[PDB]
Amino acid sequence: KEIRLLVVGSSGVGKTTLCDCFFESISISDIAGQQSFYACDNPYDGYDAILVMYDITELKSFTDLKTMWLPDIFLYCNIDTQIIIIGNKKDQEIDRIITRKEAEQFAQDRLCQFYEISTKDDSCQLLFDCISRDFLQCDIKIRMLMVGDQNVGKTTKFALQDPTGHDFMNAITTRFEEKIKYEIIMIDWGFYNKLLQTNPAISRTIEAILIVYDITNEESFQNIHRKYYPLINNKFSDVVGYKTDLEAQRKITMGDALTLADWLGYKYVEMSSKDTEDHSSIIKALAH
Numbered sequence: 014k015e016i017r018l019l020v021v022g023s024s025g026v027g028k029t030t031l032c033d034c035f036f037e038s039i040s041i042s043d044i045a046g047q048q049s050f051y052a053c054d055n056p057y058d059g060y061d062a063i064l065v066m067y068d069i070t071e072l073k074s075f076t077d078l079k080t081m082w083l084p085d086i087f088l089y090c091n092i093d094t095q096i097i098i099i100g101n102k103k104d105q106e107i108d109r110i111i112t113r114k115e116a117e118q119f120a121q122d123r124l125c126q127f128y129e130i131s132t133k134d135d136s137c138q139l140l141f142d143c144i145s146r147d148f149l150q151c152d153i154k155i156r157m158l159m160v161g162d163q164n165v166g167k168t169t170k171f172a173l174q175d176p177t178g179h180d181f182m183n184a185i186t187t188r189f190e191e192k193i194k195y196e197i198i199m200i201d202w203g204f205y206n207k208l209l210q211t212n213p214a215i216s217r218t219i220e221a222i223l224i225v226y227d228i229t230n231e232e233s234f235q236n237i238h239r240k241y242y243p244l245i246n247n248k249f250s251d252v253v254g255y256k257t258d259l260e261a262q263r264k265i266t267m268g269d270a271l272t273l274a275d276w277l278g279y280k281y282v283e284m285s286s287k288d289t290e291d292h293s294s295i296i297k298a299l300a301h
């Protein structure tokens with residue numbers, strides 16, 4: 014149901030061999046060629062994912078995957094979307110000039126996925142499920158930023174990592190939450206600034222923001238282009254004895270989250286409710 018794909022890459026390897034590797038006998042096929050002129054193109058920017066293929070044994074594939082291919086159709090595609098990066102060949106593995114470590118690190122630091130494939134046998138097909146699974150397991154994904162600092166940010170999840178997470182950058186994915194089967198991803202503060210070393214104006218991809226507050230926070234700073242870049246969108250500040258001047262006053266930023274907060278063995282309420290009814294708040298909006 015609702016499945017249309019696209020496959021991009023250099024003329025070295027574009028989308029071809031997967032036609033002969035389809036061997037069909039969901040997730041229709043191919044395309045990326047013929048069609049025309051921003052008709053089927055930005056319609057393909059309406060449906061799910063796209064595949065970035067590069068022949069490993071030659072570098073210019075990867076080089077102009079970085080400088081040429083990504084930025085055009087990256088910001089063109091919808092918020093969920095994004096791309097899967099795939100090295101080709103790799104059955105040979107000998108003449109291979111690209112270690113997948115640098116590739117995958119560039120990818121996950123572009124927040125984009127990564128895989129390599131032998132399309133001669135096995136692993137090729139073994140990619141498709143690893144796509145469709147996420148497509149079938151998750152109906153809708155949302156991307157959101159967590160800004161803040163110090164202790165309280167250190168406190169507030171899926172229990173992943175620890176107050177020592179993975180050094181200076183990572184992303185955190187959380188399973189589960191009306192039979193939606195959707196998904197959401199939370200992101201480090203400095204990581205937002207880190208991937209616009211790669212892609213700026215990626216603030217289109219974040220449908221929601223989250224802020225944390227401790228006994229001393231001015232918080233007039235992280236909100237510069239937390240204001241300017243996302244603009245209207247959706248927003249929340251969640252941070253028992255709260256301090257309500259700031260609640261009434263310090264949101265001129267408007268947004269939801271009246272300064273919700275919890276600390277207790279009851280802290281379930283906090284993360285659960287906050288991440289949930291906000292999602293239901295986002296979904297109905299839509300509007301392109």
Ligand SMILES: Nc1nc2c(ncn2[C@@H]2O[C@H](COP(=O)(O)OP(=O)(O)O)[C@@H](O)[C@H]2O)c(=O)[nH]1
Nearest residue numbers: 024025026027028029030102104105131132133
């Ligand atoms: N070494 C290697 N080459 C492959 C494999 N699968 C497809 N090809 C090559 O792909 C070429 C044609 O399509 P391709 O270059 O990948 O895409 P195109 O540039 O858009 O035509 C053929 O010359 C094949 O040799 C593979 O598993 N290993």
